[PDB]
Amino acid sequence: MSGPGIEGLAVGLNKGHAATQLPVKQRQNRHKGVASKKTKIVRELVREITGFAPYERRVLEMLRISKDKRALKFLKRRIGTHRRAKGKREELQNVIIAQRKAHK
Amino acid sequence: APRGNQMLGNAHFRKHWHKRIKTWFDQPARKLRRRQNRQAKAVEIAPRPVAGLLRSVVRCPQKRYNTKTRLGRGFSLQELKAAGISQAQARTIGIAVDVRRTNKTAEGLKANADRLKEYKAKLILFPKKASAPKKGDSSAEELKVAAQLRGDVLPLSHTITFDEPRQVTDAERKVEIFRLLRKERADKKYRGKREKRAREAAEE
Amino acid sequence: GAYKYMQEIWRKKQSDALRYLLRIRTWHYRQLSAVHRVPRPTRPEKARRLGYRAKQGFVVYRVRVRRGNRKRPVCKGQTYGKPKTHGVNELKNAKSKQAVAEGRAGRRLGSLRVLNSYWVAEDSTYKFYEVVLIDPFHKAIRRNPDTQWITKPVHKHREQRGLTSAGRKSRGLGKGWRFSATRGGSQAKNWKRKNTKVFHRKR
Amino acid sequence: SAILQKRLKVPPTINQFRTALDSQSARQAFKLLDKYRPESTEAKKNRLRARAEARPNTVRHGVNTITRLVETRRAQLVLIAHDVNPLEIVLHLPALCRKYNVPYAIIKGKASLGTVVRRKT
RNA sequence: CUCAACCUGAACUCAGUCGUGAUUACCCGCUGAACUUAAGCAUAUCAUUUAGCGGAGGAAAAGAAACUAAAAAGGAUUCCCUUAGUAACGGCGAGUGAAACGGGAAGAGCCCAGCGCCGAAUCGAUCAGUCUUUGGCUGCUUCGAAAUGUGGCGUAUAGGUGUA
RNA sequence: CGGCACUGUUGGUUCGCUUGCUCCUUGGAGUCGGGUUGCUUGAAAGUGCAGCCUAAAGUGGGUGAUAAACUUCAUCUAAGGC
RNA sequence: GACAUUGUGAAGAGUCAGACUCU
Question: Where are the transmembrane segments (chain D)?
Fold first, then answer.
């Protein structure tokens, strides 16, 4: 902290030359990534039309039997990455919940 | 067969280097060619400055250089807005625009804003049609003084200044500078371990 | 619009509908010649995205390319060298199958200019690509100031010079330390620059 | 190819295009549609010189236009050609219309619809 | 079974175009050795190089960040000096081996698909006028391309509506 | 023979452009990613390229040079073009 | 040998809880 004998530190968690921060505004290029409402509707409709892939069906059966670990391992092997496998497993679990609520 | 005390050879000449040889016998010729190109460009775009667009003031990225400043690619949109110049107006007036650069600090923004203001003050604008001048357009006796500028536009100054002598204060003298530096280093080094200990204590 | 729906549907290649359609289309493609003019693009949305326009002067061909590695063309696998060069079988071509298909189309049609290509089907033996080409001398192309660029001499045989989108993929171009090997626009040019012995005038 | 299409099992979303409007309903639909055919070439010729000297209801066409109309719930009836090739061009229209509660029918003949619209298909 | 559409595919000494083959100094994409060095030799080296194939221009290619980085930050591509025989690779042997920051030459930005609005407002031949006719401008000329969508606005710096 | 600057004249063309406020809106798939194989690099638990298998998502995706989870962030916006 | 090309039905056995695996 600036004071007698200190004008700024070159090391430590408080290192840095003193400066005044402007408010942060998200750049335009940062917006890419968010689905629009129309895009979400399109994706839901295309899902309803086309259906599921064979590995998605196998994971659905695994989740039905409540083998979350086996489903995660299978999705890791197929999709490839832990992050993507977790995302796909969450989506398929949501599908399981929706089917249960609709039927029973 | 190296003999005696020698520095072990290191020459990289085991490739067919005779096929790739570059000489510099045309250095003065290239110098003259670039001078001639500059003269031709000056004639083509007179009375506009030969250097071309005006460039911004920048701070060198790394801490090894961050005490220096240099010319940039252009002026950020924030800088243009602060100086009251549109991007299109800057383009037609001859100011470089850096569409990628963004300002995160008031001091850096203000330095370039002042640079833009000074350039606008020094600018001379000729009538679009010589017969009929318009608003913002420079006056006739101003246009009579117009001359082509050579070299960088608004060149930077690299002179170093020495702080005025002052008095040594007791508050300054009482600080333990080495202990302060070591304390900062220790705090940064052991931050995470202390957080882990605090979390474990909270769980207990 | 409908184009978003076409894109999303085509993204689901394992669905029953697209599986059936691909089965039918692959069977149909297998019965035709290796390079064959097609009346209209099979994937209009993809063609539009790559730069196709339903205008006189744009044509579409279908190219079939055999899959697998590139066997080294030597007699009885005889290499006549050190063991490091004895490989004959597990050698992979430097250009992708799509680039090979684009090159075949461009070679066959020397009077046109290859613009782009896209995937349409595949089986264990063949891969099928549809290549969009432009006639650089049709007036509908020459008088349009947007497509006038491809009607210039410097754009002859882009697919033989590796300038199309697919061809560029194999050249390792890019920005950053990952793609530093091709500074100057080509690996060969960068290597020449790095390995040239420079003799300054005064030294 | 025709034999193979008959022989292979067709998923429902593809098979839905095989069952089109019966002959009588299709005739009624075309009778209604022909009342709003776009402006003819002869009509355009006659209108051009009159306008130089000096937009009713019409059938809309084009998958993008029809998709926008359906999504905006502005179309009252939609007729989808049963033989669109590639089929992915219109593979979404039945479901989209059923989702937006727009009456829709798969009718026989993209060429017939193009004739109604003064086009090829 | 008659006639009429579309789709797909043909034949034309049909009307008008276009490609082929050369050149090697430089340029772009592939293919790809061994002599040699390691005092032997197989990885390694020679070398991502002789040789072979293809493709352009007056320059080519690259090019407007899915970048560098971790400052109080830089800001397309190309090229020079320096970084530097350095980080790194290597029977860690012989040997090989960059880049950013920094100083300079030159510096110029942009267009689509998609979403959305207008929705055929777009375009090629042919005919007839007209001109400054080895090409241009006008059309109730006649055909055709185009709704499986040509053109206009518009692309990350966003963009658009309305409004001052 | 070219290049310029100014005058005349022929043809075409211009409801735009900037800044403030208001509301609406905003994107590339057999591609990315993963496994394995081969080549390549100074790139070292994979720098670049390609074959086969697998195969996405939507504040998602890529990157931050030692691999993996859980965490702070920073920085861009790939798979289209001049 | 595995994966893909590879689709449509039956019977048996085994896993489960209508599916999978095999022959």
Answer: none
Bridge partners, C37 (sequence order): C61
B104 within 8 A of A22, measured Cβ to Cβ: yes
According to DSSP, the residues that pair with C132 across neighbouring strands are C60, C116
The residue in chain B having the minimum alpha-carbon distance to the alpha carbon of residue C203 is B24
- Token pair recorded at residue C50: 């790559």
List CB contacts of D81: < 8 A, sequence separation 6 or more. D90, D106, D107, D108, D109, D110, D113, D121
Q: Which residues of A touch C17 (CB under 8 A)?
A: 49-51
Among the partner-chain residues A38, A43, A50, the one whose CB lies closest to the CB of C15 is A50
Assess whether C97 (CB) lies less than 7 A from strand F. yes
CA–CA separation, D7 and D1 (whole Å): 10
Tokens of B91: 């383009």
Chains that touch D (3 or more CB pairs under 8 A): A, C
Cα atoms found within 13 Å of the Cα of residue B26, Cβ hemisphere only = 5
The conformational region for residue A63 under phi > 0 = left, psi -120 to 50 = alpha, else beta, is: alpha
**Cα A68 to Cα A21: distance, rounded to the nearest angstrom:** 47
Interface of C with A in 8-27 (CB under 8 A): 8-9, 12, 14-18
What residues pair up with C62 in beta bridges, in sequence order? C36, C130
Among all chains, which residue has been given the structure tokens 């192309």?
C141
Structure-block tokens of residue D51: 């306008």
Cβ atoms within 10 A of the Cβ of C6, count?
Answer: 23
Helix (H, G, I), strand (E, B) or coil at A98: helix
What is the token pair recorded at B104? 């995160």
How are beta strands C197-199 and B21-23 bridged, if at all?
parallel
Asked whether the beta carbons of residue B24 and residue C196 sit closer than 8 angstroms, the reply is: no
Distance CA C93, CA C137 (A): 34
- Mark residue D73 as left, alpha or beta (left: phi above 0; alpha: psi -120 to 50; beta: remaining): left
Tell me if C5 and D68 make a contact (CB, 8 A cut-off): no
Give CA separation, C9 vs A46, C15, C49, in Å.
6, 9, 15
Q: Which of D96, D100, D101 to mutate to test the interface with A (most CBs of A within 10 A)?
A: D96
Which spans in chain B are helix H?
27-45, 77-83, 87-93, 106-122, 140-143, 170-174, 177-203
Resolution in A: 2.6
The whole-angstrom separation of Cα C97 and Cα C129 is 9
Beta bridge partner(s), residue C36: C62
Interatomic CA distance for residues B153 and B155, integer angstroms: 6
Q: Given an 8 Å threshold on Cβ–Cβ distance, is C9 in contact with D96?
A: no
- Does B14 lie at the interface with C, CB-CB under 8 angstroms? no
Distance measured from the CA of protein residue B87 to the C1' of nucleotide E110, in angstroms = 15
Stated in angstroms, how far is B129 CA from F8 C1'?
17
Residue closest to C137 by CA, chosen among C121, C157, C153: C153
Query: What technique solved it?
Result: cryo-EM
